[PDB]
Amino acid sequence: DDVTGEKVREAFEQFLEDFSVQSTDTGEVEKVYRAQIEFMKIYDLNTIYIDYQHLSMRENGALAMAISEQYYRFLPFLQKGLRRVVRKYAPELLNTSTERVFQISFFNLPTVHRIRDIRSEKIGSLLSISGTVTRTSEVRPELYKASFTCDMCRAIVDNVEQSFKYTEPTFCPNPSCENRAFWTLNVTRSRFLDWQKVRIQENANEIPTGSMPRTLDVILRGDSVERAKPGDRCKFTGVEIVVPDVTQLGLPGVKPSSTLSLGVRDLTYKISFLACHVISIDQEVFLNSLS
Amino acid sequence: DDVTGEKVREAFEQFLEDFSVQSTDTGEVEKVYRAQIEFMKIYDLNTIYIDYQHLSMRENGALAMAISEQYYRFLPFLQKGLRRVVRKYAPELLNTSTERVFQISFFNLPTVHRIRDIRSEKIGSLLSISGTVTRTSEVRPELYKASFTCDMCRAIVDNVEQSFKYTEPTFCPNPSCENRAFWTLNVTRSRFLDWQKVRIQENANEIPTGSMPRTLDVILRGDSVERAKPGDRCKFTGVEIVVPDVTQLGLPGVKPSSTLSLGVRDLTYKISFLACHVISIDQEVFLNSLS
Amino acid sequence: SEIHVRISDFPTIYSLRELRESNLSSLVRVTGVVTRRTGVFPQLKYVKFNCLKCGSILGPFFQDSNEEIRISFCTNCKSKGPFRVNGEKTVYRNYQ
Ligand SMILES: [Zn+2]
Ligand SMILES: [Zn+2]
Ligand SMILES: [Zn+2]
Numbered sequence: 001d002d003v004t005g006e007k008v009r010e011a012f013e014q015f016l017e018d019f020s021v022q023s024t025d026t027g028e029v030e031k032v033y034r035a036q037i038e039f040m041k042i043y044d045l046n047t048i049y050i051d052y053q054h055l056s057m058r059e060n061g062a063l064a065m066a067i068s069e070q071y072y073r074f075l076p077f078l079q080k081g082l083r084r085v086v087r088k089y090a091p092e093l094l095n096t097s098t099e100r101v102f103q104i105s106f107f108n109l110p111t112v113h114r115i116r117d118i119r120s121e122k123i124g125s126l127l128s129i130s131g132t133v134t135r136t137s138e139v140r141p142e143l144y145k146a147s148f149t150c151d152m153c154r155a156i157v158d159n160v161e162q163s164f165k166y167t168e169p170t171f172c173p174n175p176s177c178e179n180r181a182f183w184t185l186n187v188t189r190s191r192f193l194d195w196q197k198v199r200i201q202e203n204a205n206e207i208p209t210g211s212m213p214r215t216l217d218v219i220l221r222g223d224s225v226e227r228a229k230p231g232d233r234c235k236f237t238g239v240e241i242v243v244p245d246v247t248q249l250g251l252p253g254v255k256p257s258s259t260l261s262l263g264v265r266d267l268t269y270k271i272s273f274l275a276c277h278v279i280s281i282d283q284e285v286f287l288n289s290l291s
Numbered sequence: 292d293d294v295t296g297e298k299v300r301e302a303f304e305q306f307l308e309d310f311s312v313q314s315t316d317t318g319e320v321e322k323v324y325r326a327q328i329e330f331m332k333i334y335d336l337n338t339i340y341i342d343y344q345h346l347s348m349r350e351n352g353a354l355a356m357a358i359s360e361q362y363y364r365f366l367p368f369l370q371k372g373l374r375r376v377v378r379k380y381a382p383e384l385l386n387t388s389t390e391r392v393f394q395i396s397f398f399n400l401p402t403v404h405r406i407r408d409i410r411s412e413k414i415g416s417l418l419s420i421s422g423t424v425t426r427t428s429e430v431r432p433e434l435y436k437a438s439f440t441c442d443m444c445r446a447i448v449d450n451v452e453q454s455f456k457y458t459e460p461t462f463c464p465n466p467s468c469e470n471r472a473f474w475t476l477n478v479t480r481s482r483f484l485d486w487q488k489v490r491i492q493e494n495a496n497e498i499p500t501g502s503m504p505r506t507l508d509v510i511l512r513g514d515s516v517e518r519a520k521p522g523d524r525c526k527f528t529g530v531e532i533v534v535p536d537v538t539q540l541g542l543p544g545v546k547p548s549s550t551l552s553l554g555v556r557d558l559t560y561k562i563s564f565l566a567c568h569v570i571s572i573d574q575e576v577f578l579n580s581l582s
Numbered sequence: 583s584e585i586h587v588r589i590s591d592f593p594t595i596y597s598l599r600e601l602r603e604s605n606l607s608s609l610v611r612v613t614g615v616v617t618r619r620t621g622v623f624p625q626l627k628y629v630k631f632n633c634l635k636c637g638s639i640l641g642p643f644f645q646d647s648n649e650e651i652r653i654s655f656c657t658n659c660k661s662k663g664p665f666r667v668n669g670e671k672t673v674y675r676n677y678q
Contacts, residue, residue, distance in 0.1 A: 432603045432606065483606065517599060
């Protein structure tokens with residue numbers, strides 16, 4: 001294992017408990033993260049909103065910089081730390097009632113990147129984008145964790161994690177088997193989340209001289225599905241992501257390729273986005289959202 | 292199922308349980324069989340001596356006639372009956388310390404039939420044959436209860452008792468298999484019975500005029516193995532059994548056959564004898580034997 | 583590569599004809615007179631099956647003395663053809 005990952009995970013779960021923002025005159029000081037955890041237990045939701053400003057304030061923002069620069073690498077550590085914190089205080093909401101997935105969303109990033117500002121050096125990092133929603137697809141299931149039926153000693157392995165791509169369980173329900181050639185998936189022991197792809201488009205005011213509009217594909221995973229109608233300006237916060245592309249086969253420039261036998265595979269990709277959450281920009285509900 | 296077999300089995304159980312007779316002038320009325328059960332339990336023996344006259348006196352000899360005439364079918368029923376008798380009275384010796392294969396060795400039959408007097412109608416029946424021991428084999432282990440490892444859905448399953456022909460378990464520890472590819476035996480878990488094939492000649496006095504001494508092959512199992520001496524006159528008690536013969540294919544006369552795609556098996560046999568009781572016909576030892 | 587332990591002075595002594603079957607899978611101490619020797623024969627100890635479909639040889643698999651193991655499937659590339667043995671890389675043991 002990695003020592004640095006353990007360090008960042010333990011610090012994460014440490015300040016999920018030790019952090020406490022003041023309430024100024026009215027309310028003294030309260031544990032904002034613990035207050036949000038109590039809110040989570042009360043409403044039985046599935047996603048926790050964490051302000052980036054507080055993380056920047058804490059510990060001279062070194063941990064904030066570390067989590068912003070390498071969000072993808074530390075994400076499983078973040079999930080584990082949050083699970084342990086939930087176990088410490090109010091562990092009732094841990095399970096679905098098999099297991100309930102906890103989503104972590106960061107909001108109020110210091111800066112906003114336009115679609116034309118996407119850069120390769122920001123790949124895998126945390127940032128925010130602002131675009132206009134053009135096409136929205138159906139909310140479809142995706143394999144959070146995948147179960148399969150064995151080939152030799154036909155039997156079903158239960159609740160195995162499914163990565164970004166198809167995975168094969170190395171272990172077997174029968175330990176003597178150690179055969180994985182033919183797996184038959186079963187939906188019962190396979191977890192799922194909500195998947196929806198939204199094609200955002202650059203806003204008019206951000207377009208340079210002469211350039212025709214540029215657009216990006218944004219994937220909304222979790223409760224944020226169907227949160228934006230087509231033709232609305234929304235602010236997306238998430239992690240910069242890459243997805244394989246097979247169309248750029250004749251483009252100029254040497255195509256990266258992997259050799260392994262032969263083991264050939266063209267490493268061509270296109271940039272996309274995975275957004276943690278989306279923010280847009282009777283008389284009772286209307287009357288409520290006023291000062 | 293067969294009603295007659297079960298009825299005869301329970302009748303045998305009852306007759307054994309309530310066996311009664313005066314013991315000489317001393318010992319009063321002694322349930323010789325029930326007391327000898329614990330007498331042989333003292334040494335944890337594996338033989339139960341069923342004198343024929345005991346079985347013959349009761350039920351006007353009907354039980355003895357049923358046992359003698361159709362011994363091969365009744366023998367497993369008698370085994371279950373003996374196990375139940377051990378369960379009811381004297382259950383302390385059942386375990387080997389799986390379960391000792393108790394031997395029912397009948398004796399004191401009415402008549403002894405010679406080798407020349409062996410007949411094809413009386414196969415499957417109980418009788419005594421007297422001959423001269425000429426050739427004896429080694430004490431080679433014989434497969435009686437086997438442990439089979441299924442090629443598919445691999446595991447170890449015991450208690451798959453071996454029949455006269457090879458037998459493998461159709462049901463598997465993991466039922467999804469239901470396949471019998473390479474059921475593999477193991478040394479440490481399978482059960483075996485001592486075995487010995489003894490060749491016997493016809494006695495000189497009973498040889499027909501102008502004929503050669505006809506021979507016979509006799510199978511010895513259990514504690515009765517390695518009892519006969521080459522050149523020692525001995526009597527054998529048991530059942531006539533047929534064994535496959537691959538030599539008598541060119542002999543004259545039609546041959547038994549089957550049809551099931553030819554689906555045909557060349558069916559020939561030669562008559563042998565499975566025996567249970569065999570007997571041979573320091574000065575203190577000889578003095579002790581002396582009356 | 584390996585070491586062995588040679589047990590001595592077992593209590594019970596059985597003659598050859600008294601083995602019967604209870605002594606199965608058990609340590610026995612018997613005495614006799616040697617009659618025939620079969621010479622010294624190499625026997626497979628650390629066999630290395632080769633996979634011509636993989637490209638090179640596979641790992642050294644310990645050969646059980648009860649029976650000869652077989653490569654029905656290659657756990658790596660699922661090869662049905664090559665399961666042969668290379669007498670150079672294979673490490674043998676004495677047998678008599
Ligand atoms: Zn399996
Ligand atoms: Zn099976
Ligand atoms: Zn291979």
